[PDB]
Ligand binder design. Structure first.
Ligand code: CLA
Ligand code: CLA
Ligand code: CLA
Ligand code: CLA
Ligand code: CLA
Ligand code: CLA
Ligand code: CLA
Ligand code: CLA
Ligand code: CLA
Ligand SMILES: CC1=C(/C=C/C(C)=C/C=C/C(C)=C/C=C/C=C(C)/C=C/C=C(C)/C=C/C2=C(C)CCCC2(C)C)C(C)(C)CCC1
Ligand code: SF4
Lengths: 152, 80, 140, 151, 733, 88, 30
């Protein structure tokens, strides 16, 4: 497959790793009575371990000789969940934070003593700007097109 | 000996003369600023180069400048 | 006309390890004088407390900066006036401060400018323009 | 008890029972290095005698052959070797410090303040004769300890 | 101007110990001596180069001499894979008998050091066979050392002193260096490979006494002059050739085979002969570009002046740059150091992966020392390249004669440049460290399958384009019908495809997630180190915190505690800061090289592929695992030949840690302390008699930064070299 | 009054602390022995030639003839040497 | 051994001592 890898759902070392992991937890599980709180807890970890390994197999993750998932970030369309997609989400949120942050410095920049709203948040003003971030791509592109985004 | 120089942006506020720990500087009459005085550095052989004077100076871009230079037992501040 | 230098008494001091060393015998040293209205404890610039005598007061010191530091403290705390001198190993004395009888903080006629450049600092030439001359940009 | 040095409270020192006591001032004024009017050559001979004799001890008893039969001879050679190198330090110290015409840089006054002739140890020839005595004294002092210990 | 620093009365008149220190430290900064001229500046440099050549020749001469006199070269050349090569004898009277035994190795009759420099493989590959061969080589280099001193002395005599105008004849020096220094030397070196080295590899013995009567090729020069050049490639060595024997020996002198001699695991001599001949032709043609005395050729100044984009996006382009460069020696040395730094890394990268020397590929410790030695040399050289860029900006840069040109325009937008390096460094640091820390936590929590393990797909795709099949990408030379594959099938591709797909050499090693992470660590180091250095150079003339900085020169302690504080504000301090970052970067690259190779050599790359994706893996499975033989070079039970490296290993830790003192505690603390020692000395009887001639003073602010940096760097290098050599040689990979 | 321009030596305290000008208290004939036997070593220029060359030659002799009973480095290796890690 | 026992003490004891003594006198001269 890509980069000589094989799907984690077909990988023997991946399956071995799940098995060695559950066996590790079962060595601790056998210390405690089956109704006990530690037994329930170790069992909860075990089920979560099983959910995790089946989930990685069903999502299409490729595995190396090590039996571990390896991410494909090249652009390949079978692996957009490994970089492109969470990355678009990161840039959307990161731009939201920065656009809101700039909105607040601009809103207070002509105030009397501007550093006063920088050490003591004007929370009412901020609740009014916090949702400007939802549309930062359109707002930032618009301030660009009409000389408002960068100074000369 | 260190070099000390005064530039004509000096407003004659005297703050460097008061800061100086070895009396390098003095005020002299001048017609160039409202205070009608400017600093001067006639005793730089006693100058140690602490730059207390630059710390004192109010002008955007120092009117008094200290250029550390050849060391002597006076500039090095040695008592031995 | 600079002040004189006799053999006035020194403050009351038990001695310390902070005083003159071989430099005084071989290079130079300094003496500060002053007149106090009364006996009083003050701090020696070399560490510890001494008692100055009323009237004349002579004090030998190793450095010029020690003199000015003590003298700066005499004007501020004790409101007394002071002078000091540089003494060479040949006995030659040299008056130092206040130079022209006037403390350098206050303008005084007769003083000539030393080191004054009649331009703003940012107008110094680039080092390349004074290379292979013996000058720095701040010397022109 | 603790007085200013020679009554001057502005000299950088003190006069304590360690610096100037009747027994201290006597023993220090009796060492060959404080015999200001005696021959510097004979000072160095006593100095070299005392030191070269002292140096035999640590070299022999702690050297790399301390537990062998070649012990006394090696540390003694190492002791004389230390005297040889020290005599070069004493020599170059004089060549750099004192010139062939300079007067003694020693104090010309006394504790009471009277004028005496400075210690000619602090001169070019006075140093040259002192280090010459140290070298002769140090070699024979190494041998004298080597004589008493393993002969 | 009457004592020690004869070139600086300013320092000669310093009454303190500072005079001696700075006299030493400034002796080679000619520009800052009393009454230097432009002429004297060039002349001193010129003679100083002859002295540097003399030392280089002298040094090589001793290496030859010591191998011939005390080494086992003649036994090594008869069995190169079973003889540890000897550097020189050791004679140390501090040794105990167990140290004398442990260090007696090779075929030697006494304690010796084993050579990790690779000179045996080098000298053997190029034809040296006998201790005599080595002796006359050493004598010849001794002669060259002497001649270099004769010319150095000569050209400092008034009759032979060259004029400034001669040192600035750029067009003539380039023509001569390209065609002659580079070209003819390469052509001549191919002549040596053809006449001596290649016959040596085929079990013949060609020396000055017989080389006139033996043909390098049975057809003589006939094929050369008739154009029938293929004849010289005709009958190449067999892939079963045994080096230094006639077994399977051919007669070709110029080939293009690619890949490796299968027994020696190094490049074919007939390939290297062809390479030096080919590039020679290119240098010889290229050295005819510039105008000299004959009415043809280019003016470099005119070429620069012509290269200005119509449209103005580079302002005045390159106008003025000829004299900016030709009149500034720091500009010239900056370009020299920058270029030499790139190619020193190239040497390190290419020599480990395409070794030229027979039986060096299997001398694992040598390959480790050689790669590490050049990457550290390259790092230092790169920092000097920017440091002299800074010095150029202060001493030599003329704003008015560079007005609006590409160089001035760099100063105009320094904030853009610096803040983007800052951004790139911040991006790489947050994410590279963030990713390693995530993986560590996943390992900590017993969930390694939750690591982030990004495949280096772009580089793997490049390896596949080169013909490596490991990844299934099937591109270009990995394809079956690419025109690229078809064009080279008949020539170098059979030997190349073979080498690149052999996974037990070092040609294009297989890479996975571990190689991804540390390459971004490396990009972090390159970006941050250049940030320090570019910011240092571009602010050298001035910043808003110190707009007149150019008036203070390259190195000054600071500008005092006013305006908020100004410690470490000079361009010299930016260099000083960058050295830590360069040492960091090369550390990362050399750790990586070594750990990738030691697990290769040991036969389990998987130890690296798995333990390298988190940082506990590096600490435990690289540093801690590989220290066990080294720290036992001596123990309560005895010692062995690893004793030196165990001692140097700790020595390196000690020098490094002592550096921290000069770096963390600053001057004023120490000046006051020294004063109480001045007092104590003048009040101690007997010792009163002795007096210093130089007043004791604490070191200077800048001085301490340097002394600390030097301690730090020295211990850095000695610690890692001791570890590198001991860990690799204690097992041979 | 510890200040005096005519006696700058006392003002700065240039006193001999323990220097005694008492005459030589030595065996005066031993003096004639020490003054004539230790005499050739009293020229610093010649003594430096002597200590440098005499020590250099002596150091060279002792090191050139040092027996194996003293120096392990001259005694040499006695055990048979062990091979290298890769049959080296 | 017949030459190392000569040059090792010469370059490691004599030469540095002669060099250190030489440089001490040049740096201290006036
Ligand atoms: C090193 C530089 C580099 C860069 C910048 C990219 C960039 C990209 N790759 Mg990628 N890729 C690279 C190297 C690189 N790749 C290498 C070396 C390989 C070999 C393994 C791949 C294999 C690869 C695959 C298999 C695919 C991508 C795809 C993509 C696109 C991401 C999705 C997207 O925005 O579609 C927007 C696309 C466009 C705006 C135009 C793309 C088409 C033109 C010709 C480019 C994007 C253009 C995907 C793609 O193109 O989706 C359509 C895709 O399927 N890449
Ligand atoms: C309004 C917030 C804001 C915005 C829009 C930016 C924007 C930028 N910064 Mg800056 N920065 C900020 C805050 C901000 N910064 C703060 C608080 C610091 C101090 C830690 C810095 C320190 C910093 C450095 C050191 C560098 C940048 C750089 C940059 C540029 C590249 C992106 C980058 O490196 O991000 C980097 C962001 C950070 C390092 C930290 C900022 C993240 C904080 C959490 C966001 C602000 C939160 C703020 C409290 C919101 C309150 C609003 C509320 C009242 C409504 C870009 C112009 C780089 C540059 O110049 O490239 C050209 C660069 O080198 N910034
Ligand atoms: C730690 C250093 C050291 C060592 C190992 C020695 C060792 C020695 N000293 Mg010694 N000494 C030292 C420092 C040292 N000294 C110092 C600092 C001084 C002051 C300058 C002296 C002053 C001194 C004098 C005045 C004399 C010695 C003597 C001796 C020897 C007598 C010991 C004995 O009986 O045999 C050891 C016995 C066994 C191990 C059993 C011995 C070789 C004596 C000597 O040399 O006799 C000729 C002697 O009279 N010492
Ligand atoms: C053919 C004529 C000729 C030749 C041969 C040279 C040769 C040289 N000149 Mg030049 N020069 C010439 C004409 C010539 N010049 C003319 C006409 C002028 C006046 C216009 C000058 C003016 C001049 C100046 C002013 C200076 C020189 C200098 C030098 C030396 C540079 C230092 C050095 O060794 O580089 C060696 C470089 C090479 C061998 C080229 C290789 C470089 C690559 C990067 C290395 C390749 C490494 C390779 C892989 C090695 C394998 C590994 C190895 C272990 C085997 C070199 C000897 C400098 C010097 O040192 O003066 C003493 C100097 O300051 N020249
Ligand atoms: C072609 C190579 C080359 C050349 C010709 C120069 C030439 C010059 N450089 Mg430059 N430089 C270079 C490479 C070069 N450099 C490199 C590679 C770097 C990176 C380190 C630098 C970094 C650099 C800086 C930061 C500075 C210079 C300066 C100078 C000038 C004078 C240097 C001086 O007097 O120091 C003379 C130095 C000595 C006589 C002794 C120095 C000893 C060093 C510091 C420590 C050695 C440690 C050693 C390994 C100890 C081993 C211990 C043992 C146990 C192993 C001169 C113009 C200085 C200058 O004047 O510019 C204005 C300056 O400040 N350069
Ligand atoms: C667990 C998830 C995770 C976490 C915790 C972080 C944490 C961080 N990232 Mg990262 N990143 C991630 C996932 C993550 N990243 C993914 C999946 C991607 C792929 C898209 C990236 C791509 C990425 C970039 C390209 C950058 C970061 C940056 C940052 C830092 C500040 C970002 C920020 O919001 O400041 C608050 C926001 C601001 C201060 C505004 C300025 C910064 C944002 C990113 C500008 C976005 C708009 C702009 C048009 C898009 C970039 C254009 C181009 C360069 C791509 C911070 C250390 C920034 C950084 O390293 O700065 C030095 C940065 O530039 N990250
Ligand atoms: C391991 C030690 C270490 C670390 C982590 C750094 C880190 C950094 N150095 Mg530094 N440096 C060091 C040693 C180190 N240095 C040494 C020994 C020297 C020699 C004096 C220097 C000299 C130096 C200079 C001169 C320069 C740097 C620069 C940088 C930045 C590089 C860009 C980067 O990675 O951005 C990413 C930032 C980091 C990796 C810093 C850590 C981020 C943390 C982990 C995030 C914390 C999040 C968490 C919520 C915090 C909770 C804490 C709690 C108490 C509230 C970064 C801040 C350059 C710079 O500023 O570039 C912009 C620069 O110019 N350094
Ligand atoms: C690199 C040069 C070098 C060389 C060749 C030596 C050589 C030696 N060292 Mg060493 N050493 C060196 C550097 C060197 N050192 C440095 C840099 C240090 C400081 C870290 C030391 C610290 C050191 C210690 C602490 C000791 C040695 C000792 C020894 C001796 C051990 C041999 C033995 O067992 O006999 C032992 C031999 C004797 C006890 C007597 C030998 C008599 C000598 C050879 C006569 C010298 C005569 C001559 C006038 C000396 C002046 C020469 C002058 C002109 C330069 C041997 C002579 C040991 C030693 O000599 O014991 C005292 C010892 O204890 N070394
Ligand atoms: C070129 C550098 C070089 C280096 C680093 C060494 C290193 C060494 N030699 Mg060797 N040697 C060399 C060249 C060199 N050799 C040459 C060219 C000759 C033939 C003339 C010799 C002949 C020789 C003998 C006969 C012996 C050594 C020995 C030694 C070892 C102890 C040091 C010693 O006694 O030096 C001896 C040094 C000389 C005899 C001087 C010749 C070397 C040149 C002329 C001086 C180099 C000056 C130097 C580069 C200054 C540069 C700094 C400058 C910028 C200020 C040591 C491993 C000894 C040994 O094997 O120990 C076991 C030993 O017995 N050497
Ligand atoms: C500051 C300053 C300075 C400095 C600078 C520096 C230091 C720089 C560096 C720089 C550098 C360090 C850079 C580098 C670069 C590189 C490059 C530019 C490369 C390129 C490459 C290429 C292009 C390639 C390609 C290819 C491939 C990849 C494959 C094969 C084919 C080919 C070959 C095509 C100076 C002196 C100027 C002066 C002024 C100031
Ligand atoms: S401080 Fe600046 S302005 Fe005030 S007097 Fe001195 S120089 Fe003139």
């Amino acid at each position: 497959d890509i980069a000589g890898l094989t799907p984690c759902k077909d990988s023997k070392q991946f399956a071995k790793r799940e098995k060695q992991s559950i066996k590790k937890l079962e060595s601790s599980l056998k210390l405690y009575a089956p109704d006990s709180a530690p037994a329930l807890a170790i069992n909860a970890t075990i089920e979560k371990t099983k959910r995790r390994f089946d989930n990685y197999g069903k999502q299409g993750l490729l595995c190396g000789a090590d039996g571990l998932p390896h991410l494909i970030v090249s652009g390949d369309q079978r692996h957009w969940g490994e970089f492109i997609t969470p990355g678009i989400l990161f840039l959307y949120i990161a731009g939201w934070i920065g656009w809101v942050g700039r909105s607040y410095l601009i809103a207070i920049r002509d105030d009397k003593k501007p550093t006063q709203k920088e050490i003591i948040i004007d929370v009412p003003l901020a609740t009014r700007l916090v949702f400007r971030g939802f549309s930062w791509p359109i707002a930032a592109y618009r301030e660009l097109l009409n000389g408002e985004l960068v100074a000369k | 000996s260190h070099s000390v120089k005064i530039y004509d942006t000096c407003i004659g506020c005297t703050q460097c003369v008061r800061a100086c720990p070895t009396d390098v500087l003095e005020m002299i009459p001048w017609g160039g600023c409202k205070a009608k005085q400017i600093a001067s550095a006639p005793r730089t052989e006693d100058c140690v180069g602490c730059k207390r004077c630059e710390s004192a100076c109010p002008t955007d871009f120092l009117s008094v400048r200290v250029y550390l230079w050849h060391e002597t037992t006076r500039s090095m501040g040695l008592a031995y | 006309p600079p002040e004189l230098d006799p053999n006035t008494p020194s403050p009351i001091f038990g001695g310390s390890t902070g005083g003159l060393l071989r430099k005084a015998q071989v290079e130079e040293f300094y003496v500060i004088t002053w007149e106090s209205p009364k006996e009083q404890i003050f701090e020696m610039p070399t560490g510890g407390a001494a008692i100055m005598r009323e009237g004349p007061n002579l004090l030998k010191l190793a450095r010029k900066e020690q003199c000015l530091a003590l003298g700066t403290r005499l004007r501020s705390k004790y409101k007394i006036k002071y002078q000091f001198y540089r003494v060479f190993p040949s006995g030659e004395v040299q008056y130092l401060h206040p130079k022209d009888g006037v403390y350098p903080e206050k303008v005084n006629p007769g003083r000539q400018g030393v080191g004054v450049n009649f331009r703003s600092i940012g107008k110094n030439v680039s080092p390349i323009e004074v290379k292979f001359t013996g000058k720095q940009p701040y010397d022109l | 008890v603790v007085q200013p040095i020679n009554g001057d409270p502005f000299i950088g020192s003190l006069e304590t029972p360690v610096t100037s006591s009747p027994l201290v001032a006597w023993y220090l004024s009796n060492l060959p290095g404080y015999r200001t009017a005696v021959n510097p050559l004979l000072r160095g001979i006593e100095v070299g005698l005392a030191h070269g004799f002292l140096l035999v001890g640590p070299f022999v008893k702690a050297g790399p052959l301390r537990n062998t039969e070649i012990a006394g001879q090696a540390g003694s050679l190492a002791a004389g070797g230390l005297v040889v190198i020290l005599s070069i330090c004493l020599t170059i110290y004089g060549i750099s410090s004192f010139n062939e015409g300079d007067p003694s840089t020693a104090p010309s006054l006394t504790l009471t303040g009277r004028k005496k002739q400075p210690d000619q140890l602090q001169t070019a020839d006075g140093w040259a004769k002192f280090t010459g005595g140290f070298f002769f004294g140090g070699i024979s002092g190494v041998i004298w300890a080597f004589f008493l210990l393993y002969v | 101007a009457l004592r020690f620093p004869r070139f600086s009365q300013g320092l000669a008149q310093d009454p303190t110990t500072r005079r001696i220190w700075f006299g030493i430290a400034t002796a080679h900064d000619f520009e800052s001596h009393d009454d230097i001229t432009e002429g004297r500046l060039y002349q001193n440099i010129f003679a100083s180069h002859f002295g540097q050549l003399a030392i280089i020749f002298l040094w090589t001469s001793g290496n030859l001499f010591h191998v011939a006199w005390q080494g086992n070269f003649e036994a090594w050349v008869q069995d190169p894979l079973h003889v540890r090569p000897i550097a020189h004898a050791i004679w140390d009277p501090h040794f105990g008998q167990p140290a004398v035994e442990a260090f007696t190795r090779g075929g030697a009759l006494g304690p010796v050091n084993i050579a990790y420099s690779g000179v045996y493989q080098w000298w053997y590959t190029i034809g040296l066979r006998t201790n005599e061969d080595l002796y006359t080589g050493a004598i010849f280099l001794l002669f060259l050392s002497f001649i270099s001193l004769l010319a150095g002395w000569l050209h400092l005599q008034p009759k032979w002193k060259p004029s400034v105008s001669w040192f600035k004849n750029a067009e003539s020096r380039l023509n001569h260096h390209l065609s002659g220094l580079f070209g003819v030397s390469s052509l001549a070196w191919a002549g040596h490979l053809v006449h001596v080295a290649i016959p040596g590899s085929r079990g013949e013995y060609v020396r000055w006494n017989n080389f006139l009567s033996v043909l390098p090729h049975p057809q003589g020069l006939g094929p050369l002059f008739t154009g029938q050049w293929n004849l010289y490639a005709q009958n190449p060595d067999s892939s079963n050739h045994l080096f230094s024997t006639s077994q399977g020996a051919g007669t070709a002198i110029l080939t293009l085979l690619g890949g490796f001699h299968p027994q020696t695991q190094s490049l074919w001599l007939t390939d290297m002969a062809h390479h030096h001949l080919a590039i020679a032709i290119l240098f010889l043609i290229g050295g005819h570009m510039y105008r000299t005395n004959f009415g043809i050729g280019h003016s470099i100044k005119y070429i620069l002046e012509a290269h200005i984009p119509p449209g103005g996006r580079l302002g005045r382009g390159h106008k003025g740059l000829y004299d900016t460069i030709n009149n500034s020696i720091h500009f010239q040395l900056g370009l020299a150091l920058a270029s030499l730094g790139v190619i020193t890394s190239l040497v390190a990268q290419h020599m480990y992966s395409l070794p030229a020397y027979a039986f060096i590929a299997q001398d694992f410790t040598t390959q480790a020392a050689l790669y590490t030695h050049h990457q550290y040399i390259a790092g230092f050289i790169m920092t000097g390249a920017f440091a002299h860029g800074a010095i150029f900006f202060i001493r030599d840069y003329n704003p008015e004669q560079n007005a609006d040109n590409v160089l001035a325009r760099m100063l105009e937008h320094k904030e853009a440049i610096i803040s983007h390096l800052s951004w790139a460094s911040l991006f790489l640091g947050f994410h590279t460290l963030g990713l390693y820390v995530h993986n560590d936590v996943m390992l900590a929590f017993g969930t390694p399958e939750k690591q982030i393990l990004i495949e280096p797909i772009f580089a793997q795709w490049i390896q596949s384009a080169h013909g490596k099949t490991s990844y299934g990408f099937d591109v270009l030379l990995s394809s079956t019908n690419s025109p690229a594959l078809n064009a080279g099938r008949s020539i170098w591709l059979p030997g190349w495809l073979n080498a690149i797909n052999e996974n037990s050499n070092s040609l294009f090693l297989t890479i996975g997630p571990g190689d991804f992470l540390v390459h971004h660590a490396i990009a972090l180091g390159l970006h941050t180190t250049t940030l320090i250095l570019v910011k240092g150079a571009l602010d050298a003339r001035g910043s808003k915190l110190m707009p007149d900085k150019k008036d203070f020169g390259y190195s000054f302690p600071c500008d005092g505690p006013g305006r908020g504080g100004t410690c470490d504000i000079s361009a010299w301090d930016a260099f000083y800061l960058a050295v830590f970052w360069m040492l960091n970067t090369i550390g990362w690259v050399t750790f990586y090289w070594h750990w990738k190779h030691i697990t290769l050599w040991q036969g389990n790359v998987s130890q690296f592929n798995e333990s390298s994706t988190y940082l506990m893996g590096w600490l435990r499975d690289y540093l801690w695992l590989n220290s066990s033989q080294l720290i036992n070079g001596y123990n309560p039970f005895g010692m062995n030949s690893l004793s030196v490296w165990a001692w140097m290993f700790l020595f390196g830790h000690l020098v490094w840690a002592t550096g921290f003192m000069f770096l963390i505690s600053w001057r004023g603390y120490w000046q006051e302390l020294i004063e109480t020692l001045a007092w104590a000395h003048e009040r101690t009887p007997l010792a009163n008699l002795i007096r210093w001639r130089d007043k004791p003073v604490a070191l200077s602010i800048v001085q301490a930064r340097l002394v600390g940096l030097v301690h730090f760097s020295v211990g850095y290098i000695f610690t890692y070299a001791a570890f590198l050599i001991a860990s690799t040689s204690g097992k041979f990979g | 009054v510890y200040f005096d321009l005519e006696d700058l030596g006392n003002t700065t305290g240039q006193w001999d602390l323990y220097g005694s000008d008492a005459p030589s208290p030595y065996n005066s004939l031993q003096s004639k022995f020490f003054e004539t036997f230790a005499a050739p070593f009293t020229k610093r220029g010649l003594l430096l030639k002597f200590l440098i060359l005499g020590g250099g030659s002596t150091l060279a002799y002792f090191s050139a003839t040092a027996s194996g009973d003293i120096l392990p480095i001259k005694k040499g290796p006695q055990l048979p040497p062990q091979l290298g890690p890769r049959l080296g | 051994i017949n030459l190392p026992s000569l040059f090792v003490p010469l370059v490691g004891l004599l030469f540095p001592a002669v060099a250190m003594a030489s440089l001490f006198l040049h740096v201290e001269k006036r």
